[PDB]
Amino acid sequence: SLSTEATAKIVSEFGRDANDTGSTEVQVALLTAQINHLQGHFAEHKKDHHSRRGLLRMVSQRRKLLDYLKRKDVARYTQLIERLGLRR
Amino acid sequence: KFCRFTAEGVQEIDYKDIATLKNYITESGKIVPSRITGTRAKYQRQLARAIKRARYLSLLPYTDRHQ
Amino acid sequence: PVIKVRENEPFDVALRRFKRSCEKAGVLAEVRRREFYEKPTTERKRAKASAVKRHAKKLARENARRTRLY
Amino acid sequence: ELQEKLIAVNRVSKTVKGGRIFSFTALTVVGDGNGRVGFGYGKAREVPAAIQKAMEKARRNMINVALNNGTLQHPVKGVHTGSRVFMQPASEGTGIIAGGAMRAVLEVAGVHNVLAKAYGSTNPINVVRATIDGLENMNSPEMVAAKRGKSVEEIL
Amino acid sequence: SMQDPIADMLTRIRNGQAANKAAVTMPSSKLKVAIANVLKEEGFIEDFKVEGDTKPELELTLKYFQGKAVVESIQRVSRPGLRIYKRKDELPKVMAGLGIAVVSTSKGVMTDRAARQAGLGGEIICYVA
Amino acid sequence: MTESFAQLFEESLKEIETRPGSIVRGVVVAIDKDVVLVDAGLKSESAIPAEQFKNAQGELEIQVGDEVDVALDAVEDGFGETLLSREKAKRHEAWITLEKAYEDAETVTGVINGKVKGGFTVELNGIRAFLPGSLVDVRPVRDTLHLEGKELEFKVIKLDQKRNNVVVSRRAVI
Amino acid sequence: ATVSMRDMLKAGVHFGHQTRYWNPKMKPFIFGARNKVHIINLEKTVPMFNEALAELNKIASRKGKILFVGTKRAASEAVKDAALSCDQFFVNHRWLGGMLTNWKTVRQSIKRLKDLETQSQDGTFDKLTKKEALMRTRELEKLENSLGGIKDMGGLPDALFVIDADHEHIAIKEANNLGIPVFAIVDTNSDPDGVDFVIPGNDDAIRAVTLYLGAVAATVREGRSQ
RNA sequence: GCGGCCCCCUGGACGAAGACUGACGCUCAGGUGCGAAAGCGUGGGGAGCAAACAGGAUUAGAUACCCUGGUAGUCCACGCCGUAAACGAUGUCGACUUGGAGGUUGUGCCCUUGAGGCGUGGCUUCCGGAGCUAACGCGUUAAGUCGACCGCCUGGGGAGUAC
RNA sequence: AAGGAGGUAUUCAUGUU
Ligand SMILES: [Mg+2]
Ligand SMILES: [Mg+2]
Ligand SMILES: [Mg+2]
Ligand SMILES: [Mg+2]
Ligand SMILES: [Mg+2]
Ligand SMILES: [Mg+2]
Ligand SMILES: [Mg+2]
Ligand SMILES: [Mg+2]
Ligand SMILES: [Mg+2]
Ligand SMILES: [Mg+2]
Ligand SMILES: [Mg+2]
Ligand SMILES: [Mg+2]
Ligand SMILES: [Mg+2]
């Protein structure tokens, strides 16, 4: 998964204090970081379906979170996806 | 009965501690069952791993025949 | 089973000890079980049936010591 | 005063080494035409003995039905095994509109006007059990008002 | 997922009566409180109360007369998969008036007798016999 | 003054003792040829077989109304019975007597059964001990047959109470 | 007469069965557990015992026949003594499945026993060659042992008082089938469903059964004295 | 479906106390992905086993069971295939309803007196109550009482066949 | 392979061997 230091770094970057770990932007950033991380793994190990399933769960959860954020506050949604560099 | 590991607060069995494993292997060199020894399951699995590692490092015999 | 003949022990006693060592190591059961290939499904089915009947006998005994027959 | 009725008599068999043994079973219903009804099932070697035993058994084990002027208090549903029965109160003069087993049980229990229908299996034994069960699980204004702590006028 | 809290409430009532429980408890809502008030005024439950500031819990103390449960049958009629609305003329008669249907009219929740007297229709929450 | 059963039962619970193996007194309610009804007063007047109350001559010294002492095994058995044993109390008394014999070098007579793990063994009135094989007898003729199974009045050399064994000896007297 | 918490607790009424055999139906009458043994809450025993005693008093005043049923090896002689010295009937050996429901059969057996008794006090055991006479005597002995306490009831009893409801579950079902009220001493491992007058309490100790039978017999004797 | 041991990369579950977001949830036609064994294509590898095949027997016959050999295949890499008594013959999610004996994996307290006692969560096997069921049986892991959505059934055969 | 005993099975020390 993601190391403790990386998680704390992302929380500091995206949350409005050290202790806000549940906010939607923080969750999406953590999911995006992990998803980008695993691309090397699934570029070398191409028959690891049991892990690719967890990867797809991560992608889908990020989709649901982005949809909620977009429908709840468009400004945060645009800022977040522009910072993270995600299409739609 | 009397799983001898829980009563002594054993955290991990050591493949280096041969004498203990010598108590839990039979004469032929096979692992004695937990149903015989009264060992708890978790320590039984640890014991099996440790005995296999000791066999690999030639501190215990796979069988009696080879040596 | 590597039996050493001890001093003053007769041959009958040595042979009895060797027989008991072999029976305790269970060599012949292993050989008879490895004489022919048995499918994984057959192995699993036999194991499950043995467990079921052993458990049933234990439960029957426990019930018997609860209900008198006379 | 007890009206009695035989609903069905069947010839059952029991294969033995020496051959078949045929015995006769009789289902009967008895009632006082004024709110009490029971059913009995009797088994014998012959029809007269079977009906006699069933009549005695039904004369015992009667139960009480809360009848309102020869009609039911309210629609009732009953079920026993694969037989489901629906009974509805009807205005005076319609008579008893029901199938054979329900017809017998209601006529002997004293219901004079009722709309009925059996769904599922119409096997007489289970139909009789279901309709008797439905007639028993029927509550009248007196008992419902007593149970809910109200007056009958309060319940209307 | 819990998608019919009213049906859950009726189910708890039914199961508590079948299990001879003195009282049953459930999460509270104002619709549940209205239904419990209707049941109490019609004499189907012995009492209700609400305990809690932020997460209210509705407690109903159930009623038994001759050992037997008072509520003989209670079935949700309008449900999320099929809402039922009835004009004042077509309001149902449960057990030919011996029981009561809980109807949600435009002036609050009431029995079918009260709605028919007030000349109102509405949604049919449940039947109670 | 509705004295609560809670506090009354608490008084009762401090009045008695309830643990497996505990040596507890009892009142002998009735005596029969087959069993003896005793009452320690827990859940049921238990019954104990007759031979547990018989001496070497097989005599029932116990009478009705006597207060005896038996070891409760279980307060209940699934059959609504308190289970009591007199032989357990006998073993308790015998081991306390062996303790006193160790203290006072009292010569107790018991059958030195035969060879033990570390020598010979002895058994006396429900107790068991071991004596080193070098201590077979005082005048050790080449015949060891009379060393096992016969009466010896020995003093308790030691006792490993946890092991349920003692150490007998051909002591100064023997 | 009157029993009290002190006497009940002295006799050992409060000890029920182990916790692994209890009845959830019996849960309400259970106080707590101590060393894996249930403790029966005597605060419920005392008023229930008194109400059952009052109803038995009323039936005895209304000349009701009382059937004392207790068939454990621990209460046979106690129940025989209580029903003898209370002018009522008893069963203290195996309960014959169908004593009440198959009364007709029981009554025919009663008649057979009475005929054997007439043969006994008639000089009949003389023409037979001493071995048919011995067989007849032994048959009379067995019939007396089996139906000794119920050879005068004549018809069905008006109430049953049963020790160890679970051991006598058949009698309870017969009484409920025939509409005969049942007053039952119920342990913690028994079902109080078929009982009409529950008296929670230990049903295994001779002291407790002696207490119950003495109180019930005193109440019945006083009710018939009237 | 997964079984020696070790390393590297990696998915999920559960518990303790606390903080955070604030309904973000459930189901899902079409769609996509994974999917035992056999099988197919290309390239290796091939000890044992072994369809087909060869021979020897048994039998009235023996295109089989048995014996002696034995090729594809089983193994690896990359693709295809898309089915099984793929079964708990029991769609997914949520709430409520008496108990007992265990197994495994966490965690709290009391004297841990010494492998103890008293709790509290996860998963899991058996027995059994009410209830349900045509019955067999299921029974807090329901086939009980209900709510949401999705898949199917409409006599046997012809037929899961033809087009 | 046959027969007996104990149990759901061992605590029964170590020592001895
Ligand atoms: Mg995670
Ligand atoms: Mg019948
Ligand atoms: Mg049909
Ligand atoms: Mg699809
Ligand atoms: Mg393949
Ligand atoms: Mg290939
Ligand atoms: Mg090839
Ligand atoms: Mg071949
Ligand atoms: Mg298929
Ligand atoms: Mg299928
Ligand atoms: Mg899904
Ligand atoms: Mg079951
Ligand atoms: Mg096709």
UniProtKB/Swiss-Prot annotation, chain B:
InterPro entries: Ribosomal_bS18, Ribosomal_bS18_CS, Ribosomal_bS18_sf. GO terms for molecular function: mRNA 5'-UTR binding; small ribosomal subunit rRNA binding; structural constituent of ribosome. The keyword Ribosomal protein applies. Gene3D superfamilies: Ribosomal protein S18 (4.10.640.10). It comes from the Bacteria. Belongs to the bacterial ribosomal protein bS18 family. Part of the 30S ribosomal subunit. Forms a tight heterodimer with protein bS6. This is Small ribosomal subunit protein bS18. It comes from Escherichia coli (strain K12).
UniProtKB/Swiss-Prot annotation, chain D:
With uS4 and uS12 plays an important role in translational accuracy. Many suppressors of streptomycin-dependent mutants of protein uS12 are found in this protein, some but not all of which decrease translational accuracy (ram, ribosomal ambiguity mutations). Located at the back of the 30S subunit body where it stabilizes the conformation of the head with respect to the body. SUPFAM superfamilies: dsRNA-binding domain-like, Ribosomal protein S5 domain 2-like. Changing R103G: In strain: NEA-314; neamycin resistant. InterPro entries: Ribosomal_Su5_D2-typ_SF (IPR020568), Ribosomal_uS5 (IPR000851), Ribosomal_uS5_bac-type (IPR005712), Ribosomal_uS5_C (IPR005324), Ribosomal_uS5_N (IPR013810), Ribosomal_uS5_N_CS (IPR018192), Ribsml_uS5_D2-typ_fold_subgr (IPR014721). Changing R11L: In strain: SPCR9; spectinomycin resistant. Not a ram mutation. Pfam families: Ribosomal_S5, Ribosomal_S5_C. Changing S13P: In strain: SPCR13 and SPCR15; spectinomycin resistant. Not a ram mutation. The N-terminal domain interacts with the head of the 30S subunit; the C-terminal domain interacts with the body and contacts protein uS4. The interaction surface between uS4 and uS5 is involved in control of translational fidelity. Disulfide bonds: none annotated. GO terms for cellular component: cytoplasm; cytosol; cytosolic small ribosomal subunit. Belongs to the universal ribosomal protein uS5 family. It comes from the Bacteria. Residues 2-65 form the S5 DRBM domain. The gene is rpsE. Coiled coil: none annotated.
Curated annotation (Swiss-Prot), chain E:
Signal peptide: none annotated. Pfam families: Ribosomal_S8. This is Small ribosomal subunit protein uS8. InterPro entries: Ribosomal_uS8, Ribosomal_uS8_CS, Ribosomal_uS8_sf. GO terms for biological process: cytoplasmic translation; regulation of mRNA stability; regulation of translation; ribosomal small subunit assembly. Belongs to the universal ribosomal protein uS8 family. It comes from Escherichia coli (strain K12). One of the primary rRNA binding proteins, it binds directly to 16S rRNA central domain where it helps coordinate assembly of the platform of the 30S subunit. GO terms for cellular component: cytoplasm; cytosol; cytosolic small ribosomal subunit. NCBIfam families: PRK00136.1. Keywords: Repressor, Ribonucleoprotein, Ribosomal protein, RNA-binding, rRNA-binding, Translation regulation. One of its GO terms (molecular function) is rRNA binding. Part of the 30S ribosomal subunit. Contacts proteins S5 and S12.
Curated annotation (Swiss-Prot), chain G:
SUPFAM superfamilies: Ribosomal protein S2 (SSF52313). It comes from the Bacteria. The keyword Ribosomal protein applies. The keyword Ribosomal protein applies. Keywords: Ribonucleoprotein, Ribosomal protein. One of its GO terms (molecular function) is zinc ion binding. One of its GO terms (biological process) is cytoplasmic translation. GO terms for cellular component: cytoplasm; cytosolic small ribosomal subunit. InterPro entries: Ribosomal_uS2, Ribosomal_uS2_bac/mit/plastid, Ribosomal_uS2_CS, Ribosomal_uS2_flav_dom_sf. The modification N6-succinyllysine is found at K114. Coiled coil: none annotated. PROSITE patterns: RIBOSOMAL_S2_1, RIBOSOMAL_S2_2. It holds the Pfam family Ribosomal_S2. Required for ribosomal protein bS1 (rpsA) to bind to the 30S subunit. Belongs to the universal ribosomal protein uS2 family. Part of the 30S ribosomal subunit, contacts bS1. Some nascent polypeptide chains are able to cross-link to this protein in situ. In collided ribosomes contacts ribosome rescue factor SmrB. This is Small ribosomal subunit protein uS2. It comes from Escherichia coli (strain K12). The gene is rpsB.
